[PDB]
Design a protein around this motif. Structure first.
Motif, short mmCIF file in Angstrom:
data_model
loop_
_atom_site.label_atom_id
_atom_site.label_comp_id
_atom_site.label_asym_id
_atom_site.label_seq_id
_atom_site.Cartn_x
_atom_site.Cartn_y
_atom_site.Cartn_z
N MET A 16 0.77 -1.37 -0.12
CA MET A 16 -0.44 0.06 -0.69
C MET A 16 0.75 1.40 0.05
SD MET A 16 -1.41 0.42 3.80
CE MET A 16 -0.81 0.79 5.29
N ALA A 17 0.17 2.40 -0.70
CA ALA A 17 1.26 3.67 -0.59
C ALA A 17 0.55 4.77 -1.41
CB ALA A 17 2.35 3.39 -1.50
N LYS A 23 3.92 0.87 -6.50
CA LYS A 23 3.14 -0.43 -5.05
C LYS A 23 3.46 -1.28 -6.97
CE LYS A 23 -0.49 1.78 -4.61
NZ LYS A 23 0.12 3.31 -4.89
N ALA A 79 1.72 -5.61 6.18
CA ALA A 79 1.68 -4.70 5.09
C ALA A 79 2.53 -3.79 5.32
CB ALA A 79 0.36 -2.99 5.91
N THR A 81 4.85 -0.79 3.05
CA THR A 81 3.77 0.83 3.19
C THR A 81 4.89 1.19 2.43
OG1 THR A 81 2.88 1.07 5.36
CG2 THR A 81 3.26 3.00 3.58
N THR A 93 -0.62 8.35 1.28
CA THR A 93 0.38 7.21 2.12
C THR A 93 -0.49 7.49 4.15
OG1 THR A 93 2.21 7.60 1.34
CG2 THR A 93 2.04 7.40 3.24
N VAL A 96 -4.10 5.35 3.97
CA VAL A 96 -3.91 4.16 4.25
C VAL A 96 -2.86 3.72 5.49
CG1 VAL A 96 -3.43 3.18 1.69
CG2 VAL A 96 -1.34 4.08 3.11
N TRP A 97 -2.65 4.76 6.12
CA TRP A 97 -1.91 4.37 7.76
C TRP A 97 -2.72 4.28 7.99
CZ3 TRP A 97 3.22 3.59 8.00
CH2 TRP A 97 3.81 2.71 9.61
N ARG A 107 2.75 -3.32 10.29
CA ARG A 107 3.16 -2.69 9.05
C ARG A 107 4.97 -2.14 8.55
NH1 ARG A 107 -0.42 1.71 11.01
NH2 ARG A 107 -0.89 0.22 11.97
N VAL A 109 8.13 0.07 7.10
CA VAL A 109 8.15 1.03 5.32
C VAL A 109 9.05 0.76 4.24
CG1 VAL A 109 8.06 3.17 5.66
CG2 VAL A 109 7.18 2.50 7.02
#
Ligand SMILES: CC(=O)O[C@H]1C[C@@]2(C)[C@@H](C[C@@H](O)[C@H]3[C@@]4(C)CC[C@@H](O)[C@@H](C)[C@@H]4CC[C@@]32C)/C1=C(\CCC=C1CCCC1)C(=O)O
Ligand SMILES: Nc1nc2c(ncn2[C@@H]2O[C@H](COP(=O)(O)OP(=O)(O)O)[C@@H](O)[C@H]2O)c(=O)[nH]1
Ligand SMILES: [Mg+2]
Ligand SMILES: [Mg+2]
Ligand SMILES: [Mg+2]
Ligand SMILES: [Mg+2]
Ligand SMILES: [Mg+2]
Ligand SMILES: [Mg+2]
Length: 116
Positions: A16-17, A23, A79, A81, A93, A96-97, A107, A109
């Motif tokens: 996700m991003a 992505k 996830a 990110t 961002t 989705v966070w 998550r 990063v």
RNA sequence: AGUACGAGAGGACCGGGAUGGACAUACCUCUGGUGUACCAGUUGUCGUGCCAACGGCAUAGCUGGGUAGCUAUGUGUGGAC
């Protein structure tokens, strides 16, 4: 008969991003590396990395398509990110966070586009 | 350069190339047009005594092609720097 991979070796992850963060490129590279000893389609793709099964769901970035992010974070375990290196965290961002936080999804990063 | 800008959708300046429209001009190698003293086919009728071969007249009788010249719809060139 017997599951080819144990529960201890399963990873259900979602990429996700923000828009254009990378992505799809990241998912394509991941699939290529897992498949070597690539078209991205369907809700989830199954691959293997170092004896681990990896289910990957690539999500959309636009706020118009938050449904996909919601329905993927609902069933996912982890996830990734993705952040554009030049701009860092962007509005989607953040969105989705917050969705991942609401679903309590761990998550990691990944700062993509370091060469830009 | 999917870059700047933009939440996103989208999406440039400046710069560097390619290729067109319209217009102008020269020109006939090419594609075509015309080509009434070029070649050929063919009808009717009258001739060259007859056969054969030819001539006259019928839109150049009609028809299929066609050299040069003249030509555009054809071939080059221009408004660049
Ligand atoms: C990760 C992935 O594959 O995202 C895909 C899948 C995607 C999320 C799609 C956007 C959109 O069409 C989506 C909706 C909600 C559309 C309405 C319904 O048809 C539903 C069933 C449908 C479900 C999902 C779908 C098909 C994607 C996408 C975004 C496309 C980018 C654009 C930029 C401007 C024009 C569009 C992407 O490439 O990121
Ligand atoms: N410079 C650079 N471009 C990248 C990188 N990763 C992806 N891109 C490009 O940036 C765009 C990102 O789009 P995409 O990967 O589809 O991202 P998504 O919108 O998150 O699915 C595409 O044009 C990619 O080719 C990277 O690491 N560096
Ligand atoms: Mg994508
Ligand atoms: Mg000519
Ligand atoms: Mg000639
Ligand atoms: Mg007479
Ligand atoms: Mg006779
Ligand atoms: Mg008479």
């Amino acid at each position: 008969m017997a599951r080819e991979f144990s529960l201890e070796k399963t990873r259900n992850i979602g990429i996700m991003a923000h828009i254009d963060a990378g992505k799809t490129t990241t998912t394509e590279r991941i699939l290529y590396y897992t498949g070597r000893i690539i078209t991205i389609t369907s809700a989830a793709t199954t691959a293997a990395w170092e004896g681990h099964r990896v289910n990957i769901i690539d999500t959309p970035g636009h706020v118009d398509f938050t449904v996909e992010v919601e329905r993927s974070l609902r069933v996912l375990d982890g996830a990734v990110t993705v952040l554009d290196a030049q701009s860092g965290v962007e509005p989607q961002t953040e969105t989705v966070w917050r969705q991942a936080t609401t679903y309590g999804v761990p998550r990691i990063v990944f700062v993509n586009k370091m060469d830009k």
